[PDB]
Amino acid sequence: SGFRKMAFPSGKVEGCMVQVTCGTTTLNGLWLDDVVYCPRHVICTSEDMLNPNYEDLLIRKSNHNFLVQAGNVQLRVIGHSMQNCVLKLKVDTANPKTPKYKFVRIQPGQTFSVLACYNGSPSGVYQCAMRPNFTIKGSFLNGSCGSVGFNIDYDCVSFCYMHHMELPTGVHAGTDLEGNFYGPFVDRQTAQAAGTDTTITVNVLAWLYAAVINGDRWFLNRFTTTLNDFNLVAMKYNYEPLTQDHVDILGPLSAQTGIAVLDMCASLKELLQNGMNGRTILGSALLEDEFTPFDVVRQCSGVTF
């Protein structure tokens, strides 16, 4: 028993991290087979970040302007192109430690592990949710650009995020591995605001189930509710509406505990209306929304990779 914010083992992604330098700008790249993927803003100077013309910037660079280092070994660049916000550097050596992988775009509410890196080397690993407003609440400093987020599904690494920037509010924004930003953001130092964030209701339910599985039961009550009545309440508190799809995804946890989803919803309703009321759940005094139902199944069933 016990329930922790738990990240995927990072070794398969660690062996893909390299350093990419262009001019005096250094960040991280991801080396899969004979290509290094990194954020395109590596090619900017500060004379460019007002209103960068990336195509034009890239035209002026040659292969020899890109220094890629894999530990001590320099990897020679033999081609460059840009796919949306990601620079693809072809190199003269394919990475022998390339895992089985795919590129996926995650949806709001879903979670992934981030391997935070500086200078092509790993700093630490932690779990993040894609927020409903398409930001993440990570831990990144200058030079972390190109750090990636990922899930491991069976034997396969699913890369879903590359870090590009911090917003003025202190939250973080980035792209999928095909270079498309999550949300309404661009890779420019311009004033950029996110939508208003919302609480990921399905995940809060997941976490309440986790709590029951691990013996925290005080918030349970005899009441049950309807999807409509639940949503009337929850939406006042800036919670995402719960849909039938979400109820279905909670099935394994309702099965495990024998607490119907609409029964747990009446617990959540009471928690919203009366607060945590001086108690804790799984070591927290707030309702936690960054575990998905799949995260709970994974951790409580001991899935391996």
Binding site: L27, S144, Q189
Partner: peptide, 4 residues
């Protein structure tokens, strides 16, 4: 200098 937030483009990381």
């Amino acid at each position: 200098f937030x483009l990381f």
